[PDB]
From Swiss-Prot, chains A, B:
One of its GO terms (biological process) is miRNA processing. It catalyses: uridine in 28S rRNA + S-adenosyl-L-methionine = N(3)-methyluridine in 28S rRNA + S-adenosyl-L-homocysteine + H(+). It is found in: Cytoplasm, Cytoskeleton, Spindle; Chromosome, Centromere, Kinetochore; Cytoplasm, Cytoskeleton, Microtubule organizing center, Centrosome. The gene is SPOUT1. S-adenosyl-L-methionine-dependent methyltransferase that specifically methylates the N3 position of a uridine in 28S rRNA. Required for association of the centrosomes with the poles of the bipolar mitotic spindle during metaphase. Also involved in chromosome alignment. May promote centrosome maturation probably by recruiting A-kinase anchor protein AKAP9 to centrosomes in early mitosis. Binds specifically to miRNA MIR145 hairpin, regulates MIR145 expression at a postranscriptional level. Keywords: Cell cycle, Cell division, Centromere, Chromosome, Cytoplasm, Cytoskeleton, Kinetochore, Methyltransferase, Mitosis, RNA-binding, rRNA processing, S-adenosyl-L-methionine, Transferase. S-adenosyl-L-homocysteine binds at residues 201, 204, 224, 253-254. It is an enzyme of class 2 (transferase). GO terms for molecular function: miRNA binding; RNA binding; rRNA (uridine-N3-)-methyltransferase activity; S-adenosyl-L-methionine binding. This is 28S rRNA (uridine-N(3))-methyltransferase. Its EC number is 2.1.1.-. Transmembrane segments: none annotated. S-adenosyl-L-methionine binds at residues 204, 224, 253-254. It comes from Homo sapiens. GO terms for cellular component: cytoplasm; kinetochore; mitotic spindle; spindle pole centrosome.
Length: 284, 284
């Protein structure tokens, strides 16, 4: 049940030429991570509004559409939502789509103790659950197979959000984490033992074709911005290194003989994850 | 000196949400082909203004900026040129950049016979060449090493446009070809013996990791549109097949276990070329 996390700088968005393209770029980052079943995106400050906007946009696209009205008030950072590309991930389904799992928001309707909670799972009727939970929390509902066809609510139980993947093979979205500097990308990892495999990307790294990935459980691929990973490194007072290869288990160039002087970050992610997917599958 | 050609449908542009994004998409196609040193892009009609616009935009970005004013009158298809991303390819260089090769446009200035031609290569002074050529033709000038430092023109000789690559290792741009249907992608190949390796892309193809590419000299990777390669196949009266795998030497899925229902064409190109680059280098 290995994980993959991706770190890019929020400053990527400042290089955009129009506010629309600023949004659209943010959407391209989300789709690339969704395509490769990324579990976590880490938006880090290379030098703070660029990272907030990027993270927010990432969270909006990750969130099942029927839940965005509840989790996202009207925000200026979402003023160009429409011109986006849907993630079309397995938890972004329509209402007339049978599914074993379904994301949900715990509603505010009265319930005597003992009587579980009501959850909006975007179905025709709400879902009554087992546990009594706070009303406004996002949960992962597993629906009862044999339901009670005339009941005014469906029934299911709140399960771990990692159940759809580690149990049914279904990609179920990423989480988004805001990092305040480059060293916080590593130090603030969501996992106890940290990232046991860390992969940095540069045109000065070694050839990906020669790289050998060790067995792992939590992998982090890290991408720089306009100025490369060198900028977040020099900016960070914690770091104090001369060359970024030393902060990573591996420092790879994933496009030998590129035909353009520069690969932009959103292009580098698709190329890098493609070029690493073989080794990532087999090592995990 | 093997070649790689990429075929996509011009209809890709109709799916865009705003005229700006229509342009920007076209720019993403060019950058992806430039990054992987593609030699030829084939824009084919899946069903005709979408393919013309796409081809034109591709030719504009390929063309050294100092030559675009000459080769491109003011066109409505270029009304959003600015919001593009430069290719930044080795033949897109500044004026104070020494280079052995340099693209050029044969100028209109008088010349007695015997006296070669004048070529604008975007330098401080024009270039006098060996041959007497038509005035308005795009050529590839190789500059004389020892030039004559006080002469009012530089000197060089017109060489094959395939010299910068097959001689100095430099990527030197793609050409753009308009195809009228899917079978014209193959039949109208710029090479005598055709494409001896043809690779189709679909989520229904075999796993790229198992594919074995035969030795080759001219390779063509083909990408479908919104409706996949099935649409250009059914539309084309020449074809008359039930499943597209039979039109290609290889039919590959290049993203096992995608996390999104659909990979858009501009995303599929970066992922596919990355996933095939290893085998493409070694086989050619
Ligand atoms: N060939 C390549 N291999 C792997 N990653 C690359 C790459 N080219 C660009 N990238 C990624 O895309 C990001 C932006 S490209 C910025 C390049 C910068 N001028 C520099 O010299 O560092 C980089 O930080 C890197 O993470
Ligand atoms: N997993 C994958 N592997 C290789 N190419 C893919 C791919 N997913 C999408 N593509 C490419 O991107 C194009 C647009 S995606 C269109 C998919 C369409 N619904 C269908 O079923 O065919 C496709 O024509 C294909 O060339």
């Amino acid at each position: 049940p290995y994980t993959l996390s991706v770190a890019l700088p929020g400053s990527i968005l400042d290089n955009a030429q129009s506010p629309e393209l600023r949004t659209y770029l943010a959407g391209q980052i989300a789709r690339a991570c969704a395509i490769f079943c990324v579990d976590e995106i880490v938006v880090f400050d290379e030098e703070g509004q660029a990272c907030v906007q990027l993270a927010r946009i990432l969270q909006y696209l990750e969130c099942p559409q029927y839940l965005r009205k509840a989790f996202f008030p009207k925000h200026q950072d979402l003023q160009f939502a429409g011109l986006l590309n849907p993630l079309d991930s397995p938890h972004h389904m329509r209402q007339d789509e049978e599914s074993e799992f379904r994301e949900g928001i715990v509603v505010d309707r009265p319930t005597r103790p003992g009587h579980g909670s009501f959850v909006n799972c975007g179905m025709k009727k709400e879902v009554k659950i087992d546990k009594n939970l706070e009303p406004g929390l996002r949960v992962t509902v597993r629906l009862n197979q044999q339901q009670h066809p005339d009941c005014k609510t469906y029934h299911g139980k709140v399960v771990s959000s990692q159940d759809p993947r580690t149990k049914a093979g279904l990609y179920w979205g990423y989480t988004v984490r805001l990092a305040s500097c480059l060293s916080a990308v590593f130090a603030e990892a969501p996992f106890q033992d940290g990232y046991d495999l860390t992969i940095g990307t540069s045109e000065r790294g070694s050839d990906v074709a020669s790289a050998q990935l060790p067995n792992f459980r939590h992998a982090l691929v890290v991408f720089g911005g306009l100025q490369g990973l060198e900028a977040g490194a020099d900016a960070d007072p914690n770091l104090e290194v001369a060359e970024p290869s030393v902060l990573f288990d591996l420092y790879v160039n994933t496009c030998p003989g590129q035909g353009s002087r520069t690969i932009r970050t959103e292009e580098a992610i698709l190329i890098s994850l493609a070029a690493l997917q073989p080794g990532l599958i087999q090592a995990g």
